[PDB]
Amino acid sequence: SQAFQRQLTALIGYDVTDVSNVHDDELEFTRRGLVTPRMAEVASRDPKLYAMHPWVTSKPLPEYLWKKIANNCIFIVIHRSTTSQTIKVSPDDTPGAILQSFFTDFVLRVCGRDEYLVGETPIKNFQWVRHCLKNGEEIHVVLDTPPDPALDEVRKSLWDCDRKFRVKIRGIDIPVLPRNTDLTVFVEANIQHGQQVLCQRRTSPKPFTEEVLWNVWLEFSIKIKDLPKGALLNLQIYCQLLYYVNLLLIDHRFLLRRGEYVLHMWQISFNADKLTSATNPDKENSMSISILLDALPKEMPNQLRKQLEAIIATDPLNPLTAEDKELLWHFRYESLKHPKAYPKLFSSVKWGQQEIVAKTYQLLARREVWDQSALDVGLTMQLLDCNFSDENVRAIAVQKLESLEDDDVLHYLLQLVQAVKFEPYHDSALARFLLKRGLRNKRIGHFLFWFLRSEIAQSRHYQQRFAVILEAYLRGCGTAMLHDFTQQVQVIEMLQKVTLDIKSLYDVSSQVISQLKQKLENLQNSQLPESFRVPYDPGLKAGALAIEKCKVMASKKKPLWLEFKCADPTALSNETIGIIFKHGDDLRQDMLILQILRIMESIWETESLDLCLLPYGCISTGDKIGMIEIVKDATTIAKIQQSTVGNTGAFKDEVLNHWLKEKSPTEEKFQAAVERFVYSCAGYCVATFVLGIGDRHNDNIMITETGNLFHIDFGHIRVPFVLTPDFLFVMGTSGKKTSPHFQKFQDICVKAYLALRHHTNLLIILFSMMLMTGMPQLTSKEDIEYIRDALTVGKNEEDAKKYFLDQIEVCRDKGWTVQFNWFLHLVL
């Protein structure tokens, strides 16, 4: 089993047995603590359903999809060898019903995909079916034998200390210091709990040298017993802020931190990295600090009610005053009757006092209203952010998540994984939760893998914790998937090498095109796996490369344009699988943005609205490097312009409509392309405005020959958004005018906008989290408070409607101005 731990390590990209960077045994302890949850989920999953991983949903079929059906008669073409026959099926009839309705043990696998139509669920509740109906595609399935469940086989007293807590600051040491002669530095020690500072003590400013000694006893104002579980000893060096490092004061065994510590610190407000209990691995170049330290048990007046309700009604980002907190607390039993008051109520708690925390735990023991309340993801997410370090509080959040069906877990998987960074300890209810769902479902497990590996590869701050979690998963996912992952990682590594090697050698000369195709030839020949799963789409199995179609794109970061053949013989079309390999950008920012877009879509699904967004696949695999899905038949908006007038930025209003008339043959399809455009344009206008990324160069905007608009390059990020005159022309308008299509556009936008405001809290918390865990450069107070204004928090539906309509009018008044300006900067 020695080559087994080796296998996991090479699959993880980090050695979880390496104890070189620890000052305790929390990590190793967590490895053991996860064994039970690991085996408890492996021994309780249905082998058959787990092997076929049916992808289903319990949500009602949207309205725009019901009208796609004729007589409640959905046609399903079945194949078995070379023959084939169609069948009329009831949307409410099970796959089993269809089976007996066919013969009148075999299962219905989807053609070309590793997807299965199995289980006791209506045919209308399969994602693949809903996908087909939406795209007007025809459902084709092949009849073959169920996968062998054998292939999944798995390898067999603190409260008696009244003393004021204190820490001795021996000094700070650094091998080599910056060439900035010569500043002064002091050490600032904070006792934190959920980004809430309980006490703060500094040292005296000393001359900045490679060795600074203090030997100073910093005595805090907080007693030892009043120390809460999860409290952090935050040590920071100023000059302003240069270094930081954290130390849990209460360990994973409820023991008060004791003894000597030499901690290596991180170099440089609301960043999630600043919360980590991990120390800097680089011991030879990093700043170090030396400290010294020397078990934990387990009727209202009318006016006041109005006041409390008003408080409870405010948005998540609305600051609580001292008065507000005192009201919430004093009336905590009434506040408990409102689930939406929980985040605010638990922010009113003084965790710096044992007596209060005790009363708080008494309160939580009375969870009847919370338990019986319906799941509010936005509300549940709020309790898992940086503002809550109490495991009891956070546990009741993870509690409500338990009722999520695999469908919704996939919706919030990425950000749930990111929320692990907010956990005080490596072992958490959230961590075990992700682990559980990952083992219960292959699709969730697949993406869990890549999301964790994403962080492990380019995050020294949390790679250790995530490595321990990933290892736990890999020891239960099964032999089959362990093999898949292995193949996937192999091909990725090989391709990333080629990407970097190519980038080294603006024009794409022949010497590079030859070298690329040359390199790809060497790999495909006895060096590359014959087949592998597409990481951003586990259903697809890629095969051999199409070297003829492979190229280096004309961008300054020289991304690889790759094309594969579907390794599945039963595949219908002969289209290639397109993947863009790129180094230079942080694709983690793209993942989050795209994930948010998918969330905005499902939200619109609840309102029976359908904006035709194109949230393509984008997986971050390493440092400034990852893969992208290639959308077929798509070109840049700016490129459609460059066709007529390339060099100069002399943009013309009509080109777009011409380009569409050209790429559609029947004129009927042209109208379907225009309508598709009007919707896709509306959605991307609304979604982009809310996220504050609407001001882009139309080179970062693309369109499908079918009229499907969609943005790209979100790493890179005046007008509210992009509504240029050429788009407007396709809508049948130019200046002081209108159109049957423009009236439509304005209608769909207001619908979409008002629909998102119905999930304000949920968007706010996701946006806030996005900045803190994914965008190190965008983590200020005002950076997050943008989305409040964007969603017009605390406004009438009418006002908001007009507010956005004004934003639209701003695009009309600007015309090509901002685009032309983009043309001067980006182009020149």
Ligand SMILES: COc1cccc(Nc2nc(N3CCS(=O)(=O)CC3)nc3c2cnn3C)c1
């Ligand atoms: C100038 O732009 C061009 C030119 C030619 C083809 C394309 N191809 C694409 N480019 C991008 N961007 C994001 C990923 S990138 O940074 O590696 C490349 C840009 N996304 C795309 C496609 C096709 N599908 N999707 C989702 C773009």
